[PDB]
Design a protein around this nucleic acid. Structure first.
Lengths: 72, 72
DNA sequence: CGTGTCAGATAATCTGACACG
DNA sequence: CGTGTCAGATAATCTGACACG
């Protein structure tokens, strides 16, 4: 009942910039890097999931201390 | 721990049109009618809350059967 | 008395290439 | 090898007035 409401693509890239402190440039750099694949809009926007937002914070925490992308 | 994550204004009027079947014209008609007050963006957009989305469905159910606005 | 649709704005997001300590 | 910022597009949202069975 949890892996359905969260994994549903609901937010655009704006609100997720508010939750995190990540810049659209950071959040979209991780897309063409091979570790996050959020849904697309009818207008080719990016829908992020509630658990995908947690995944963008999984990276946020693995980057305030420091780490590359090939490692994660 | 529930009346904080929900009541936080997070969605714009687009995603809430997806959850409901309500048109932006309906969702914004209820604003200038005196029964819903969602937050504004820096760009003067409308942030809806997760419990505000429930309130827009409270109206959705009180309108498939039929009812005015002065009553609710 | 509730909602579709228009037309002209403004904010938000797209991809592409360039910049740099 | 990760991110700011640019410039020109397109989708998304604003307010205002008009339409109608």
């Amino acid at each position: 009942e949890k892996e359905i409401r969260r994994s549903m693509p609901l937010f655009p890239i704006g609100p997720v910039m508010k939750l995190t402190d990540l810049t659209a440039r950071q959040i979209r750099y991780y897309e063409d890097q091979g570790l996050i694949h959020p849904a697309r809009n009818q207008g080719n926007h990016r829908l992020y999931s509630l658990q995908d937002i947690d995944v963008l914070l999984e990276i946020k925490d693995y980057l305030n201390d420091g780490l590359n992308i090939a490692g994660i």
